[PDB]
Amino acid sequence: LRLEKARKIILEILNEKGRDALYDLSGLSGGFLIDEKDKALLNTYIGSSYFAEKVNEYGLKHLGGDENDKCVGFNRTSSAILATILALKPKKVIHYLPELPGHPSIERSCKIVNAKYFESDKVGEILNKIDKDTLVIITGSTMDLKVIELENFKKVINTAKNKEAIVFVDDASGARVRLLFNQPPALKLGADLVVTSTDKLMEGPRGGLLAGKKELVDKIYIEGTKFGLEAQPPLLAGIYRALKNFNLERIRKAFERAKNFDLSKIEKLNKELKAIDDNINIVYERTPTGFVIKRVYKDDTINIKKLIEIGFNLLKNYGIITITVAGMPGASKSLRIDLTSRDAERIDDNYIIKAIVESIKMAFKS
Amino acid sequence: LRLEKARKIILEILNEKGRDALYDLSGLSGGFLIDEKDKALLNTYIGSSYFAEKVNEYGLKHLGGDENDKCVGFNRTSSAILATILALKPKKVIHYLPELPGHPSIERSCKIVNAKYFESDKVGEILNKIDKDTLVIITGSTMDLKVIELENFKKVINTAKNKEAIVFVDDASGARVRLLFNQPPALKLGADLVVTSTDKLMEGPRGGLLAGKKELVDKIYIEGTKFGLEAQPPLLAGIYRALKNFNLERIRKAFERAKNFDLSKIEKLNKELKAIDDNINIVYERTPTGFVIKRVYKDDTINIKKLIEIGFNLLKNYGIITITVAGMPGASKSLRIDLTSRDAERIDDNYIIKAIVESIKMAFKS
Numbered sequence: 001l002r003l004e005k006a007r008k009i010i011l012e013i014l015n016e017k018g019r020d021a022l023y024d025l026s027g028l029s030g031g032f033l034i035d036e037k038d039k040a041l042l043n044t045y046i047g048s049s050y051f052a053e054k055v056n057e058y059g060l061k062h063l064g065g066d067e068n069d070k071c072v073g074f075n076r077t078s079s080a081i082l083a084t085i086l087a088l089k090p091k092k093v094i095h096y097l098p099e100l101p102g103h104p105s106i107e108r109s110c111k112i113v114n115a116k117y118f119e120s121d122k123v124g125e126i127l128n129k130i131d132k133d134t135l136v137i138i139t140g141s142t143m144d145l146k147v148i149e150l151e152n153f154k155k156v157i158n159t160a161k162n163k164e165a166i167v168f169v170d171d172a173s174g175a176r177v178r179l180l181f182n183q184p185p186a187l188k189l190g191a192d193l194v195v196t197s198t199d200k201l202m203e204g205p206r207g208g209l210l211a212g213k214k215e216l217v218d219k220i221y222i223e224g225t226k227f228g229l230e231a232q233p234p235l236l237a238g239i240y241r242a243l244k245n246f247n248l249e250r251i252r253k254a255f256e257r258a259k260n261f262d263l264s265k266i267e268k269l270n271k272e273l274k275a276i277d278d279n280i281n282i283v284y285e286r287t288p289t290g291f292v293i294k295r296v297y298k299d300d301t302i303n304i305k306k307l308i309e310i311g312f313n314l315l316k317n318y319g320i321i322t323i324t325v326a327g328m329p330g331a332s333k334s335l336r337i338d339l340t341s342r343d344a345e346r347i348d349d350n351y352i353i354k355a356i357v358e359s360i361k362m363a364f365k366s
Numbered sequence: 367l368r369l370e371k372a373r374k375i376i377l378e379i380l381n382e383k384g385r386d387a388l389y390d391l392s393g394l395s396g397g398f399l400i401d402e403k404d405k406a407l408l409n410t411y412i413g414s415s416y417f418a419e420k421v422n423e424y425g426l427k428h429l430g431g432d433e434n435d436k437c438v439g440f441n442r443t444s445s446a447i448l449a450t451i452l453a454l455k456p457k458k459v460i461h462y463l464p465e466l467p468g469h470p471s472i473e474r475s476c477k478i479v480n481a482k483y484f485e486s487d488k489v490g491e492i493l494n495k496i497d498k499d500t501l502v503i504i505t506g507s508t509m510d511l512k513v514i515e516l517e518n519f520k521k522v523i524n525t526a527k528n529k530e531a532i533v534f535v536d537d538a539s540g541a542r543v544r545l546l547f548n549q550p551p552a553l554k555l556g557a558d559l560v561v562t563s564t565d566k567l568m569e570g571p572r573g574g575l576l577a578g579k580k581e582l583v584d585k586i587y588i589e590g591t592k593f594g595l596e597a598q599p600p601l602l603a604g605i606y607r608a609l610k611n612f613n614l615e616r617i618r619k620a621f622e623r624a625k626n627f628d629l630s631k632i633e634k635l636n637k638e639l640k641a642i643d644d645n646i647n648i649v650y651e652r653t654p655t656g657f658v659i660k661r662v663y664k665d666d667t668i669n670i671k672k673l674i675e676i677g678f679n680l681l682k683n684y685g686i687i688t689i690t691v692a693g694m695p696g697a698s699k700s701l702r703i704d705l706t707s708r709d710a711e712r713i714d715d716n717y718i719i720k721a722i723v724e725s726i727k728m729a730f731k732s
Contacts, residue, residue: 024411029409321412
């Protein structure tokens with residue numbers, strides 16, 4: 001897994017300056033935000049019950065559960081899905097989602113219990129398959145911001161109600177995303193169960209929350225504990241802190257910041273650097289969460305080299321962590337800035353744009 | 367889950383004094399020992415690869431693996447067992463263990479893959495069932511300190527070798543316990559795979575380590591990741607710190623301390639307090655890991671009440687956390703002190719014995 005050189009310099013910055021000098025803007029970061037009180041608690045037996053109770057409390061509030069509901073932590077959303085399918089042992093699973101193909105954990109879990117599986121992004125193909133023997137799973141959204149249409153969501157729930165089928169909402173991102181679109185929480189729509197991810201537009205570790213009718217959640221949690229699928233206390237502490245700190249407005253503001261970010265200095269630099277070399281060609285794109293610099297040079301092989309070099313310049317000189325700083329592609333390759341990142345709250349637009357401009361300039365010294 | 371009153375006072379001590387004033391001697395504690403550098407790293411994308419690499423390095427060293435081996439973290443030992451059985455899909459699993467009955471995760475995992483399962487603590491019943499279609503699982507020890515006889519361990523491994531069967535050692539405690547008995551690590555005995563727990567005679571969270579032939583470990587880890595069975599980075603950080611800090615001699619010394627602990631002041635107090643009330647009857651027992659106070663009063667109902675009260679007196683006045691401080695039995699009930707606990711390193715015998723004597727005396731004020 002080549003490129004512990006990024007690991008090296010991060011450790012150097014940590015040693016010489018400290019954690020406040022590091023800014024991970026890559027977007028792909030688990031957020032582990034526990035304090036000393038939490039750490040103390042995790043080193044006692046009462047820690048397990050303490051963080052499970054806090055997760056129940058703040059998770060129910062987040063998921064719009066009522067007094068007949070419970071919320072529990074799973075290691076990942078996939079873990080909650082496996083546990084649910086193992087516990088409920090449905091004959092068939094019907095999966096409604098915004099776009100094909102789905103994430104594979106549901107189908108894989110079905111294969112283990114020998115349940116039939118069908119998926120579709122067409123409400124018509126979903127309704128006519130619902131019966132007493134089907135578990136109905138609705139994925140509420142994608143990180144791309146596509147959502148299930150509200151009227152369709154209600155239609156699926158209605159048919160399930162008429163057929164006595166259990167409705168399980170995969171709100172891995174949807175518990176945040178659909179709410180940005182002014183949709184109610186899954187449990188408020190009448191879902192029997194909901195799962196969400198603790199790091200998708202939330203400042204927690206990757207992790208799963210499962211909430212819903214006490215009886216169902218209990219059965220599923222017991223099943224999950226047989227195989228260590230449930231979240232351990234250190235994970236529950238990270239989840240608690242993510243939930244305690246969560247506010248939808250923070251997310252809305254970060255989307256606004258990306259919408260408003262002044263990227264004109266990139267274009268200015270582009271024109272300026274052609275004095276040096278007419279093959280320099282900075283290509284950028286505004287994104288819903290920030291922006292991406294897709295290329296800096298016309299020749300493809302040199303382009304790669306410089307994007308990585310710029311990534312290192314950003315890390316070394318400004319403490320900004322991005323993807324280019326790893327070894328080659330496999331994931332993105334382009335220099336991506338995600339302004340929804342927690343660390344982006346610690347720096348202004350001016351800092352980010354200056355870091356970007358100066359890091360590119362440094363890469364093109366004649 | 368009655369008795370957040372223990373949670374309450376722990377939080378009071380934490381606020382008023384701090385974490386160094388708390389000593390969890392109950393024995394049943396997950397040890398989450400990460401530092402600020404670790405916490406910093408967990409808030410970056412490079413954290414996942416960093417702690418996975420450290421776990422591989424220190425886990426291989428702990429488990430006596432060679433250059434052809436890898437060590438990976440699972441959420442729990444049960445998670446590693448499920449992942450292994452899901453990946454290898456054996457027709458039959460043969461489970462050799464020191465005493466019946468076994469822990470259920472293996473049999474439960476077998477039920478999911480429709481594999482046959484057999485267990486026995488008799489080497490004779492194990493050898494004649496081994497064939498090409500059997501996964502052979504040897505549980506090396508119990509926390510009770512019973513171990514598989516070395517010659518039996520070698521016999522099982524030999525038969526498996528002759529039958530081309532895979533040998534998987536459940537060293538959940540055995541990776542420490544069997545070594546106290548001067549046995550080699552599982553991988554050194556020729557096991558293809560080994561699993562151990564990161565909190566059984568080790569200062570880590572509950573968690574699983576799976577080590578062995580690179581190819582096998584890779585297959586199993588990929589299978590585990592389908593369902594979030596693998597350890598997330600915050601858990602890997604706790605495991606790393608447990609492994610880095612691990613030394614067998616520390617465990618040997620704690621066992622010696624328990625062996626040598628002067629408990630005579632308990633007997634002295636017993637005689638002294640009969641002046642007050644001839645129904646007071648302190649009954650204690652030395653344990654391999656420390657000692658237990660089993661009763662303090664002849665009447666059973668009052669006995670219960672006072673044991674809990676003493677537990678609270680220990681917590682309030684001396685910061686010692688034990689089981690009696692929770693609501694009634696279900697687990698132990700008696701006041702147990704486990705000197706293998708990390709927090710026991712922060713206090714001398716004098717402190718513990720004085721805390722115990724004074725806490726009992728306080729409970730019997732006339």
